[model samples]
Target: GSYNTKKIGKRLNIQLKKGTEGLGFSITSRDVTIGGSAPIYVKNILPRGAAIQDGRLKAGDRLIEVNGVDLVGKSQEEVVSLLRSTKMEGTVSLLVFRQED
Candidate 1:
């Protein structure tokens, strides 16, 4: 019910750069959210996208922050647009959540 990811998940930063196919990652929330109750996760990584190159981001890890902005309470769509809007900067930095090593 609250932003508690940092309490239980590992904290890490991921930097993304745009490729021809765009940022190359997709984020999705848990299926049970009504309006942003679920945590957002890394759903996919494409060969042409830059996230795959990060070597640490993967399908199951969730996102905690994007470009210094906390994603703790945002909806999936809101996060995507926020991600897109911020990618214009030199790099997009993501603070992430993964339950284990």
Candidate 2:
């Protein structure tokens, strides 16, 4: 099956407000070097209804941390293990890097 932001949001019950500019995008180091700004990368996640809520695995959730472990230097497979763990305790917060102009 195919999926897009709208479909994903609908499945996850996440409201996609009109004029939402940050739906999906990325920034390159070159753009930053020339534009004098930091680089932004694009990360695409599978469209899951349960993955679109605040404090949950929402569409835009950066998957910053899992099981209190930082996702830095970790491969997608490793991160998947972390997120898929049902033994997670406390808050599962994610530090999503969004570009606010």
Candidate 3:
């Protein structure tokens, strides 16, 4: 009896305003699939960060893209630098993947 067919992946557009602690969340990337490079996921959402107030981001959520750059194959360090490129700006736009339970 092998009835596992729910590999759920959902897209979410997260708008985060910079807080005192910055983005307020961290990310990690891994090659969980053969489709493409390692998929980036949301990590450690902090209380002092702006994302917490948004109330939509999840720790397991995958980061699809930031700004216009696709994060599919980008390294974790690359993603961090890329994200920092927009740090201190007025607003931040993030395209993330949410895993459905």
Candidate 4:
């Protein structure tokens, strides 16, 4: 078996020590290998745009906001539950924070 996430801890500067989960929104399905890191494949994306950034997101762009609710600090299960359980129906919203200046 390959090594995956194990111990999720926060260090002095909030650095991840060992965690089973990595966070990143996928974009393309190409086999991208960067600095010996694993490749992540993305299926869909938020924001009604094709390009990742167009200066709008940086200026002020929100992810998923419906009925004045923010989907942060939620476990993966909770996210799926919202979608799977259909507590909120039709065109779920999601805001992804990836890539930076």
- The digit string of per-residue lDDT tens for model 1 on 1-101 reads 76554465676888876666556777887764555467778788776666766555666687888878777777878889876675664467877777664
Q: Considering every candidate listed, which one attains the maximal lDDT?
A: 3
Q: Which tens-of-lDDT digit does each residue in 1-101 have in candidate 3? A: 99767766767787777767657778887557757667888877887776776766668778888766888767889988887766557356788887665
TM-score of each: 0.73, 0.37, 0.78, 0.26
Candidates by TM-score, descending order: 3, 1, 2, 4
Per-residue CA lDDT of model 4 for 1-101, tens digit only, reads 89678554311111111111211122222333444322222344334332222211221222232122443443334444443432223222334333332
Residue range 7-97, candidate 2, lDDT tens digits = 2212121222212222222112223354433332325533432233232333333333444565455555665554444242323333444
- Candidate 1 regions exceeding 4 Å error are 1-9, 31-36
Per-residue lDDT, model 3, residue 26, is: 82
Between prediction 2 and prediction 4, the one with superior lDDT is 2
Q: List the residue pairs that clash in candidate 1.
A: none
Q: Which candidate number would show the highest TM-score if scored against the true structure?
A: 3
Cα lDDT, model 1, residue 1? 70
Q: In order, what is each prediction's RMSD in angstroms? A: 5.2, 14.0, 5.8, 14.4
Position 19, candidate 2: lDDT: 21
Clashes of each: 0, 5, 0, 5
Which lDDT value does model 4 have at 7? 53
